[PDB]
Design a protein around this ligand. Structure first.
Ligand SMILES: CC(C)CN(C[C@@H](O)[C@H](Cc1ccccc1)NC(=O)O[C@H]1CO[C@H]2OCC[C@H]21)S(=O)(=O)c1ccc(N)cc1
Ligand SMILES: [Cl-]
Ligand code: NA
Lengths: 99, 99
């Protein structure tokens, strides 16, 4: 796809069998999803956004489908205003910015 | 150009006579720049993301040069940790996400 930016670049994702909406976010180093259950152990992470730093749960090697594209990588879980797909998974699906 | 997302998509911008580095941010509706003076009227706004909200000044009809391409639109000025070029200006330079 070639996605223009007149609207939010929202796509459907699938994680743990569940469809969710998420924003493709070139401004995010990391993928951050709202509270949900994920398998395995997690490790601590602090991430800094516009308003300050927060604690999140870091899960590694999570299978996620993004707009029909398969990715396997790190997902952060915490109080984000919207689910965000960051560069760690945008690279896996081959996304680029073009102008 | 085509910008890969292995690293943060940083570009040079010219705004208010000043060169700055900024992040191309498809996850942001509005452009937000670190504290600086801009001409004309403004009004206060609150914007929020991970870690909460910050108060900014909203300036309308500001010209920015983004990696060489001139665009005009609203610029928010405030204590953002990173200068961010949001969709409101990315659209004007014809930026798309491709995968
Ligand atoms: C949270 C998003 C819905 C919205 N944001 C833009 C977003 O891309 C920020 C943009 C950004 C980038 C760096 C620092 C602050 C904000 N990225 C961000 O918080 O990413 C976090 C997850 O990965 C980590 O990598 C970057 C910080 C972490 S935001 O900065 O909160 C925001 C809200 C409204 C406007 N107009 C502009 C920005
Ligand atoms: Cl267009
Ligand atoms: Na103005």
């Amino acid at each position: 796809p070639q996605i223009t930016l007149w609207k939010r670049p929202l796509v459907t994702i699938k994680i743990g069998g569940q469809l969710k909406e998420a924003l493709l976010n070139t401004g995010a180093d990391d993928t951050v999803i709202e509270e949900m259950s994920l398998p395995g152990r997690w490790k601590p992470k602090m991430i800094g956004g516009i308003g300050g730093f927060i604690k999140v749960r870091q899960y590694d090697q999570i299978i996620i489908e993004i707009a029909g594209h398969k990715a396997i990588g790190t997902v952060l879980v915490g109080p984000t205003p919207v689910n965000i797909i960051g560069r760690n998974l945008l690279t896996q699906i081959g996304a680029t910015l073009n102008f």
